[PDB]
Scaffold this active site. Structure first.
Site, PDB file in Angstrom:
ATOM      1  N   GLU A  14      -5.128   2.317 -10.990  1.00 13.98           N
ATOM      2  CA  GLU A  14      -5.822   1.316 -10.485  1.00 13.98           C
ATOM      3  C   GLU A  14      -6.892   1.180 -11.389  1.00 13.98           C
ATOM      4  OE1 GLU A  14      -6.009   0.051  -6.005  1.00 13.98           O
ATOM      5  OE2 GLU A  14      -6.083   2.566  -6.144  1.00 13.98           O
ATOM      6  N   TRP A  62      -9.681   5.583  -0.897  1.00 12.19           N
ATOM      7  CA  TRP A  62      -9.954   6.295  -2.235  1.00 12.19           C
ATOM      8  C   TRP A  62      -9.060   5.676  -3.197  1.00 12.19           C
ATOM      9  CZ3 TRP A  62      -8.864   9.687   1.858  1.00 12.19           C
ATOM     10  CH2 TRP A  62      -7.346  10.031   1.765  1.00 12.19           C
ATOM     11  N   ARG A  65      -0.127   4.639   2.757  1.00  7.38           N
ATOM     12  CA  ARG A  65      -0.215   4.346   4.288  1.00  7.38           C
ATOM     13  C   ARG A  65       0.243   5.664   5.145  1.00  7.38           C
ATOM     14  NH1 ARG A  65       4.029  -0.433   5.002  1.00  7.38           N
ATOM     15  NH2 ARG A  65       4.594   0.103   2.450  1.00  7.38           N
ATOM     16  N   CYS A  92       0.896  -1.397  -0.057  1.00  7.93           N
ATOM     17  CA  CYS A  92      -0.073  -0.147  -0.220  1.00  7.93           C
ATOM     18  C   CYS A  92       0.916   1.379   0.029  1.00  7.93           C
ATOM     19  CB  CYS A  92      -1.079   0.191   1.228  1.00  7.93           C
ATOM     20  SG  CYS A  92      -2.048   1.430   1.167  1.00  7.93           S
TER      21      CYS A  92
HETATM   22  C1  HEM Z   1      -6.694   6.122   1.593  1.00  4.47           C
HETATM   23  C2  HEM Z   1      -6.363   5.966   0.301  1.00  4.47           C
HETATM   24  C3  HEM Z   1      -5.807   4.634  -0.268  1.00  4.47           C
HETATM   25  C4  HEM Z   1      -5.043   4.795  -1.380  1.00  4.47           C
HETATM   26  C5  HEM Z   1      -4.785   5.756  -2.445  1.00  4.47           C
HETATM   27  C6  HEM Z   1      -4.399   3.457  -1.331  1.00  4.47           C
HETATM   28  C7  HEM Z   1      -3.563   2.855  -2.339  1.00  4.47           C
HETATM   29  C8  HEM Z   1      -3.177   1.629  -2.754  1.00  4.47           C
HETATM   30  C9  HEM Z   1      -2.728   1.152  -3.892  1.00  4.47           C
HETATM   31  C10 HEM Z   1      -2.361   2.032  -5.027  1.00  4.47           C
HETATM   32  C11 HEM Z   1      -2.474  -0.376  -3.681  1.00  4.47           C
HETATM   33  C12 HEM Z   1      -1.638  -1.072  -5.020  1.00  4.47           C
HETATM   34  C13 HEM Z   1      -2.788  -1.990  -5.747  1.00  4.47           C
HETATM   35  C14 HEM Z   1      -2.170  -2.524  -6.914  1.00  4.47           C
HETATM   36  O1  HEM Z   1      -0.989  -2.171  -7.273  1.00  4.47           O
HETATM   37  O2  HEM Z   1      -3.202  -2.937  -7.910  1.00  4.47           O
HETATM   38  C15 HEM Z   1      -2.858  -0.760  -2.537  1.00  4.47           C
HETATM   39  C16 HEM Z   1      -2.750  -1.907  -2.045  1.00  4.47           C
HETATM   40  C17 HEM Z   1      -3.210  -2.365  -0.536  1.00  4.47           C
HETATM   41  N1  HEM Z   1      -3.891  -1.456   0.402  1.00  4.47           N
HETATM   42 FE1  HEM Z   1      -3.949   0.678   0.199  1.00  4.47          FE
HETATM   43  N2  HEM Z   1      -4.708   2.408  -0.138  1.00  4.47           N
HETATM   44  C18 HEM Z   1      -5.393   3.358   0.466  1.00  4.47           C
HETATM   45  C19 HEM Z   1      -6.298   2.880   1.536  1.00  4.47           C
HETATM   46  C20 HEM Z   1      -6.087   1.694   2.323  1.00  4.47           C
HETATM   47  C21 HEM Z   1      -6.578   1.366   3.505  1.00  4.47           C
HETATM   48  C22 HEM Z   1      -7.580   2.103   4.233  1.00  4.47           C
HETATM   49  C23 HEM Z   1      -6.285   0.030   3.887  1.00  4.47           C
HETATM   50  C24 HEM Z   1      -6.380  -0.903   4.909  1.00  4.47           C
HETATM   51  C25 HEM Z   1      -7.280  -0.383   6.176  1.00  4.47           C
HETATM   52  C26 HEM Z   1      -5.209  -0.445   2.609  1.00  4.47           C
HETATM   53  C27 HEM Z   1      -4.702  -1.772   2.486  1.00  4.47           C
HETATM   54  C28 HEM Z   1      -4.155  -2.078   1.314  1.00  4.47           C
HETATM   55  C29 HEM Z   1      -3.826  -3.511   1.249  1.00  4.47           C
HETATM   56  C30 HEM Z   1      -3.984  -4.715   2.201  1.00  4.47           C
HETATM   57  C31 HEM Z   1      -3.113  -3.817  -0.125  1.00  4.47           C
HETATM   58  C32 HEM Z   1      -2.677  -4.911  -0.725  1.00  4.47           C
HETATM   59  C33 HEM Z   1      -4.010  -5.580  -1.098  1.00  4.47           C
HETATM   60  C34 HEM Z   1      -3.785  -6.872  -1.863  1.00  4.47           C
HETATM   61  O3  HEM Z   1      -2.441  -7.443  -1.495  1.00  4.47           O
HETATM   62  O4  HEM Z   1      -4.214  -7.376  -2.979  1.00  4.47           O
HETATM   63  N3  HEM Z   1      -5.280   0.438   1.694  1.00  4.47           N
HETATM   64  N4  HEM Z   1      -3.404   0.301  -1.663  1.00  4.47           N
HETATM   65  C1  Q13 Z   2      -1.118  -9.325  -9.426  1.00  2.63           C
HETATM   66  C2  Q13 Z   2      -1.577  -8.129  -8.979  1.00  2.63           C
HETATM   67  C3  Q13 Z   2      -0.648  -7.008  -9.014  1.00  2.63           C
HETATM   68  C4  Q13 Z   2      -1.153  -5.689  -8.602  1.00  2.63           C
HETATM   69  N1  Q13 Z   2      -0.055  -4.623  -8.459  1.00  2.63           N
HETATM   70  N2  Q13 Z   2      -2.548  -5.512  -8.506  1.00  2.63           N
HETATM   71  C5  Q13 Z   2      -3.243  -6.452  -8.576  1.00  2.63           C
HETATM   72  C6  Q13 Z   2      -4.839  -6.281  -8.567  1.00  2.63           C
HETATM   73  O1  Q13 Z   2      -4.981  -5.008  -7.517  1.00  2.63           O
HETATM   74  C7  Q13 Z   2      -6.417  -4.684  -7.838  1.00  2.63           C
HETATM   75  C8  Q13 Z   2      -6.619  -3.410  -6.803  1.00  2.63           C
HETATM   76  N3  Q13 Z   2      -5.909  -2.229  -7.182  1.00  2.63           N
HETATM   77  C9  Q13 Z   2      -6.400  -3.586  -5.328  1.00  2.63           C
HETATM   78  C10 Q13 Z   2      -6.909  -4.853  -4.695  1.00  2.63           C
HETATM   79  O2  Q13 Z   2      -6.531  -2.397  -4.582  1.00  2.63           O
HETATM   80  C11 Q13 Z   2      -5.792  -2.100  -3.393  1.00  2.63           C
HETATM   81  C12 Q13 Z   2      -6.525  -1.141  -2.870  1.00  2.63           C
HETATM   82  C13 Q13 Z   2      -7.138  -1.089  -1.295  1.00  2.63           C
HETATM   83  C14 Q13 Z   2      -7.784  -0.161  -0.933  1.00  2.63           C
HETATM   84  C15 Q13 Z   2      -8.381  -0.022   0.487  1.00  2.63           C
HETATM   85  C16 Q13 Z   2      -7.605   1.178  -1.495  1.00  2.63           C
HETATM   86  C17 Q13 Z   2      -6.953   1.335  -2.835  1.00  2.63           C
HETATM   87  N4  Q13 Z   2      -7.058   2.506  -3.522  1.00  2.63           N
HETATM   88  N5  Q13 Z   2      -6.586   0.330  -3.357  1.00  2.63           N
HETATM   89  C18 Q13 Z   2      -3.044  -7.777  -9.084  1.00  2.63           C
END
Ligand code: HEM
Ligand code: Q13
Ligand code: CL
Length: 362
Positions: A242, A237, A68, A65
């Site tokens: 994404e 958000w 954070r 994430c």
């Molecule tokens: C507030 C705005 C937020 C933004 C802009 C944000 C952004 C992101 C982004 C860009 C990713 C990578 C996803 C990808 O590459 O596809 C991510 C993954 C993640 N985020 Fe954040 N996030 C936010 C809030 C949170 C919150 C509130 C939580 C938990 C309380 C959180 C937990 C995670 C987790 C667990 C992952 C990895 C999910 C997975 O492994 O599939 N995010 N988030």
């Molecule tokens: C294999 C793989 C790699 C990679 N970088 N991403 C994916 C799929 O990700 C899908 C979504 N973007 C993930 C699950 O969202 C994460 C997320 C969680 C939260 C709470 C907020 C946010 N903006 N984004 C899959």
């Protein structure tokens, strides 16, 4: 043995939590209370304070994430009191409404009762609370292919989608003691959607693209001090990429790049023209423009990387180890335009955290 692993996780989490909360002195007595509770009941119950700080620590420890920096302002809704499917449905409805906040999105987690004998009290089937359905009928693909198997499972259960490209999946979850999950259609008034338009290119709206406002991850397990909150949906958000670089662009998702190239008036014939790259940029510009125009929170990848740099500086100032997964932290467009790309991160797993768990369908 399972008791012992619970006890060890508990000790480690209470010491760290109370230290951060300036309550180090209370640790010994609270540990004593917890040990007896585990001895008697085989488990223990978090205080409201532990649960809230636990969910925040979990976000802080989420290696993948970029968002954070804002870990300590997570809004934690404690629904360990729910017992019925109606209370669960209404909690999820309320999460959507309160998290959405008329577009000014609030990072929120709703925490349902935890597993007991590894027995789930509530099992959510949805990947996100708001997500589009997906279909394939002999060659014919409609909607979001990532939702295909969940969609087929809902349609087993008596639901039927309209077979639009943007059908909203119902909420679907199962209660302990029920063999089949239940489903409820989402009230449309709760779901904000954003039409995708481009700031300069009027024809972009000919694609009739849209996306939902709030990503609410509903299938991960929150682990805090040995307790397994398998049902604990959370949202932020979006980061624009994404939507614009995966959900609308990926060939196994909505696959819109050729259509994008056509409407922005470039040829899609030659790799050397970098037409996919150009299309990605315009689609990503469109997504950011559209969310902003409609008053729905979103962040771009440059601002998000800047915020993450501050998160790194803050971990260092507080004397906390930083963990990260470079492969997810780098944005999928212009990654080398971010500081993230040019450094490395320790991908160790630290708890509390959010974990994948097996899906009940498929
Ligand atoms: C507030 C705005 C937020 C933004 C802009 C944000 C952004 C992101 C982004 C860009 C990713 C990578 C996803 C990808 O590459 O596809 C991510 C993954 C993640 N985020 Fe954040 N996030 C936010 C809030 C949170 C919150 C509130 C939580 C938990 C309380 C959180 C937990 C995670 C987790 C667990 C992952 C990895 C999910 C997975 O492994 O599939 N995010 N988030
Ligand atoms: C294999 C793989 C790699 C990679 N970088 N991403 C994916 C799929 O990700 C899908 C979504 N973007 C993930 C699950 O969202 C994460 C997320 C969680 C939260 C709470 C907020 C946010 N903006 N984004 C899959
Ligand atoms: Cl998503």
């Amino acid at each position: 043995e399972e008791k012992e692993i619970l006890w060890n996780e508990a000790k480690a989490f209470i010491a760290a939590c109370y230290q951060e909360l300036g309550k180090a002195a209370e640790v010994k007595d609270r540990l004593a209370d917890i040990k007896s509770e585990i001895d008697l009941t085989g488990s223990y119950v978090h205080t409201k304070e532990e649960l809230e700080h636990g969910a925040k620590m979990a976000w802080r420890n989420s290696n993948r994430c970029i968002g954070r920096l804002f870990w300590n302002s997570l809004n934690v809704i404690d629904r360990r009191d729910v017992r019925t499917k109606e209370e669960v449905r209404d909690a999820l409805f309320h999460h959507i409404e309160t998290a959405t906040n008329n577009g000014k999105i609030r990072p929120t987690i709703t925490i349902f009762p935890p597993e007991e004998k590894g027995e789930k009290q509530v099992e959510i089937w949805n990947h996100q609370l708001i997500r589009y359905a997906g279909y394939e009928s002999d060659g014919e693909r409609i909607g979001d292919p990532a939702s295909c198997s969940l969609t087929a499972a809902c349609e087993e259960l008596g639901w039927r989608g309209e077979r639009t490209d943007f059908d909203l999946l119902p909420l679907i979850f199962r209660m302990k003691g029920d063999e089949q999950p239940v489903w409820y259609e989402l009230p449309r008034s709760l779901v904000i959607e954003v039409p995708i338009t481009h700031p300069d290119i009027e024809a972009f709206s000919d694609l009739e693209l849209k996306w939902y406002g709030v990503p609410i991850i509903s299938d991960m397990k929150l682990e805090v001090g040995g307790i397994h909150y398998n049902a604990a949906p959370f949202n932020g958000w979006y980061m624009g990429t994404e939507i614009g670089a995966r959900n609308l662009a990926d060939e196994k998702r909505y696959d819109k790049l050729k259509k994008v190239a056509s409407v922005i008036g470039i040829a899609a014939d030659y790799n050397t023209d970098l037409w996919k790259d150009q299309a990605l940029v315009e689609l990503n510009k469109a997504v950011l423009h559209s969310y902003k125009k409609q008053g729905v929170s979103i962040v771009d990848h440059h601002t998000a990387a800047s915020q993450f740099k501050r998160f790194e500086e803050q971990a260092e100032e507080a004397g906390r180890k930083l963990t990260g997964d470079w492969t997810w932290l780098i944005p999928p467009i212009s990654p080398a335009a971010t500081h993230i790309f040019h450094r490395s991160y320790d991908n160790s797993i630290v708890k509390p955290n959010y974990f994948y768990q097996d899906k009940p369908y498929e």
